[PDB]
Amino acid sequence: RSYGFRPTYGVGHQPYRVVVLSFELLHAPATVCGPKKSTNLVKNKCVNF
């Protein structure tokens, strides 16, 4: 069947876009890794690199 989407509808029958992100962790190596970073090239002083 088809949806009768109209502007006069309320809030329960109006069009709602829904996305689902499902994460997969197979034994295969991971290729999608989230971001990271900071920024000091400190010199003449022993720091943790």
Partner: protein, 45 residues
């Protein structure tokens, strides 16, 4: 985990020395047991 290497030189294999360098970034699960060479011709088959 993939692996491929290459190097190019101006000379059969000579008696000189040179080292091959890793070339891509391809981590894919394959029980690779095949190898195929692909040539080029102009007969247009």
């Amino acid at each position: 985990y993939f692996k491929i290497y290459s190097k190019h030189t101006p000379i059969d294999l000579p008696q000189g020395f040179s080292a091959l360098e890793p070339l891509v970034d391809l981590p894919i699960g394959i029980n690779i047991t095949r190898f195929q060479t692909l040539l080029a011709l102009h007969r247009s088959y």
